[PDB]
């Protein structure tokens, strides 16, 4: 029922038809899902190799790696890192008889896939995998066997068949190097990690979409291979040499925990919000913070200053006042507040970082049935950095105090965490430790910034939530155009990308000041793909 | 402020202009939102017919069906299934004078729209609709009147005006067949469903975007019509005949509850996470699991083994130990543990499935004001399958035990659930009951897999979270190319798609072993659309 | 490993190659992120001006505005509105020597960006910014300094370099007008807003992506400039004159709070779900609703009817029964129910809106340590409208009752909220106050609807969750085609868009009946962009 207004509004010119189109008949082809088994060899890293050789496979894309995780038994606490499938991959390489066609580091693969929620979920992200489970007997099953699937995104996936890797009758080999299983496991000290590690085995299977094409017409294309460079420990510089045609440049920082035992007080498991991290940390602290006891509590170091709560409920810790109210406290028992649970300082009369001063209100109810306090509303100022401080840093040699005044029961619940893709200096990469960034191409300054406007642009343009500081040089559509690059001038000397940052200033009495940092620079170089005598790539100069 | 580096980096060749384009003048047209009322007729299913006849409507797409849900009154418990608007649709057909142009089943329509969160939300997904409400008097209003909107996605929507259905001066009729209202309602036994069902009436209105086009130039196009085949009860096979040009093939399993009363213990209402299902189930179980009583609890079957909790809090149920601690228990009362609340077994001395053994720690506080236990931390191993077991299966004839030892008050809270789009054998389609899948085209094997790598690929390629095992044959862009299909060879005999699965093995002492299953195969056939003497389609061969 | 079925299925015709493409070499260019500082001037609104003048910048797009929010100190309660960065912008204008090239209102900018979660998050959406913080001393830091980033989406962003604004050697000026800081702040009366407002200063920096293009070839393009018209207070009409080529028309309603003090009882801060709003409101009400007291509670107006709860727990308020059970009540104390906490009525014996009657079950436990009630399960019927009623409306002159019988402590916790982008008559724009909508073009009726099917279509087509009633006239692809518009017929008189709504009927005894409403109509006009003697636009007629 069109209105008279509508039928009279339209009341000559060459007009493009937007209500019809001629359907082009495409190249004749037939796709097939193909699964292959690999040969494992053993740095002694595990390495899986897959050989693709079939005259009827003309092209392929969409590599998926499946992994069988085994049943885990015994006692102790044990979970998997989130996205375990991606955290397992150290390196991936695709190569033909002519050499390497494409390759990537596992962290860069994860960074490229981090905006793909479906892929992250298939990589193994669930409560059954990522909760920290407990075994009570040597026969208790901590984790049941399960299979995860890792989508190995390549440049060959962007335009479906248009960008797919053509096999010009050559053999194609895919090689997957794995990280050691310690990287993907979160465990306490009571778990028999030596036995688990001696018995653990990666079991991979490779899948891809193959294309049988009739009368294929191959043309040369353009591919981008990421290349990574890691700076020295705590140095504010890193240089990428032999840069002749780069499409983009990425910069970020990784913490280095090699000077520690890799032990942390808490970990939220499947829950991965900042609030979840903080809630897990606070839950671990409260068991030692407020104590209901018949007499002064026992089982703490001599350095512990445990103080009885007065009738008004306020315990003053220097300038800080902590409000403590516990219901149903027995008559033969008092309420005590640990006033220096964790403390750090560099001089005997300077500023002290004291975790007890971060709490302002603690309320809960005591349970006579379970002999413990069930906490309710907690008012505190604990941030993600406190949850990210390694346990070794509290008891460092630079600390003029004891450091860790927790009970032995609390110290036995600390977890080993060797997650290989941690960015920044906290688990969420929230704190921005870069205050200034300068990028040089040759001797001349290419780009400078103070605030993270390059990260803001990276996130806006890629529609990601976990972006980094990225200089993007290509804004042209993929595949159909040759990508735009910054191009070297060897005569002028402009053929390397030097990066210099200024790190943010931290308090020398904050434990986080001593986490070691490395600067990571990623450069995407442009390559040309040719299909004469097999598959070949050349670096564009 | 361009840097000298930038202005000297660019320091001939035919270059495509990527900073400008000539704006093509499109076909002259004017869109209008048009709403129509239908004629209802009454298998006795309701059927709504809408006639589109207007010489000035040249094309249309984007069908939306609105439905007025009436005010629900009375007593009992009552909610709507999530996405009630889509759950209401049994069948949709679009046809002209020449015959059916396009049609789909309601479940396939839901499957095609499941990745559209906006559409699912408009279909009716809110707490006011999907919470299980309670009426206390015969005049209490359980649900207020509300309107839902169902987006009926067709092939005519993919490329906006390019793919829109052209009305070549013909009459177009849309016919909507509805499911019976029992399918979309979740109620207990105290709700007067007979009266509600006698008085309920579907009230639909149809909307679409029409296009008045001046001097339209129509061309023939290609359309895909899904076709479904349902296998026999508990058979591992299903065949699709007359397959001459298919773009894709989908496979999944549906549970068949016809051998039951369709009653379930719990349902989470608006909350639809797996954890929400499990929490609702546990909340229903705890009211009978742990009892605070003055003397041995009364009101349970003679088969119930209710045991007093010792002072240490551990009750051993065969090999399983349950820890029970309840605060504030009165002095004249004890704490009791129901040790066989639900139990299933096939032999008198074999394995027993016992829901009481799935709990390891139960803590809470008794309330003297409300005479009930408020539970706190619960440690258990309840999975989604337990929440999906029908109540009839516990009391089956094959069970050598009583089965359901709950109280009458608990049994009166069970809910009828007839949701028509359930997949798998649980409400979340999480358990994978297919262990092996083989697809044959003619006599030859087209595809085999063990793990669900085809489902992994379906989800990756369609960016969905609720994918199925799907063989996709078309990777060419829609509309602008003729779609790629697997093509029949009638000379060779290759003209049907046979499907055979191997179902996963289950424990004969698990109640879920006896849920009946059907195999569903969906085949998308390619059709050609022509515009001579009205609108016509032909099957491509 | 291709199957024999696959290799025999494919066993002439001009076929388009879908496995290769010739890579076109694009225009030579180099992008750069450029940041500028502005000149501030002071309706006395702050205004930031940025001058872009550089012969080597050929084109630009992707404007980002950063803002430094200062440290907030003192006592009282203080937070920022969600998306503070967007809420700060009153107006944005881009202009060259020829005049205004493009401009938009801040509310329309927010509406265009509301589907961009990344952009909304960068605008300032976090607990640290949006929680309502408390200062206790005149030196307590309520908020730490932080920087937000506002993505100013323009038409120049849709097709990357294709749609970018060309600077034809002209100077380009960007002007940002800011809202007063009262609009972006949520505070109580104890916060020193006069001092904060005297000292607050907007500190903006502008960024954009510039393009140095070698041998650019510029062509004329088409741009759409939104234009807004606001109807008179409580009038159901609004007209847009001089409409000669419009691509779309939007309609919605804004509440007008100028007849109030802009004070509300509660606000959920960072949590922005409807349930969060309702939970914050209920949490504020419960502290006065149920009172544990030694004797009749004191500190309430003489109009307050506070009633002791009987032993059965049921207090009847006219036809409504409230169930109140509180555990651990001391022996020298009773439980009391405030039965007319908030009440509104227009006649002394007609219907009364009473907030106490909206509660059906209240349970909790009294705390002897903190002298307050910790509530548990609450059964109520509080909706978002109750949470959106302004405090002034309860104590209106039309109310024949007192209105607000809360304690002084509760009244001191009310918050000032001047959020400038509120739609509808509640904070979530959930209630639909438009029952019928008629759009006229000239004298003839262009479109009519009752239900919000135009909003349903707006949301479906734009993939948004916060759509409005929108008539869309353009369904052609952006940039590459000249947009489709409704076109004026000045001879016939069709050159204005008149809008008339019928507002929904409300109860004259509901306080929400008296919130004043304005009708907002937005019309997107089509303009042509030319590049002779700088940058110029002309209105298409």
Residue numbers in the entry:
A (entry chain A), B (entry chain B), C (entry chain C): 0 to 10, 15 to 45, 49 to 547
Article, verbatim:
In Vaccinia virus (VACV), copies of the double-jelly-roll protein D13 bind to the viral membrane via interaction with its partner protein A17 and assemble into a scaffold surrounding the viral membrane. This process leads to the formation of a spherical immature virion (IV). The 62-kDa D13 protein exists as trimers both in vivo and in vitro, and structures of the recombinantly expressed D13 trimer have been determined by X-ray crystallography. D13 adopts a double-jelly-roll structure composed of 8 antiparallel β-strands.
We purified recombinant D13 trimer protein for structure determination using single-particle cryo-electron microscopy (cryo-EM). Initial attempts were hampered by problems associated with preferred particle orientation and spontaneous protein assembly into honeycomb-like crystalline patches that consist of rings of five or six trimers. This problem was mitigated using holey EM grids coated with a graphene oxide support film, and the cryo-EM structure of the D13 trimer was determined at 2.3 Å resolution. The refined atomic model based on this structure was largely identical to previously reported crystal structures (average RMSD 0.495 Å). However, the presence of the short N-terminal tail α-helix (aa 1-10) was inconsistent with previously reported models. Our cryo-EM map showed intact N-terminal tail α-helices in all three subunits, with or without imposition of 3-fold symmetry, although reduced local map resolution and the increased B-factor suggested that the helix was prone to dislocation. In our structure, the hydrophobic face of the N-terminal helix (M1, I5, I6 and L9) was held in a pocket of surrounding hydrophobic residues from the adjacent subunits. Additional hydrogen bonds were identified between the side chains of T4, N2, Q35 and the carboxylic groups of V451, L452, and N2. The protein solution turned turbid after dialysis into low-salt buffer, but examination by transmission electron microscopy (TEM) showed aggregated honeycomb-like patches and rodlets without any IV-like particles. We found that the N-terminal short tail α-helix of D13 is critical for in vitro assembly into ordered structures. We propose that repositioning of the N-terminal tail α-helix away from D13 toward the surface of the lipid bilayer may act as a molecular trigger that initiates scaffold assembly in vivo.
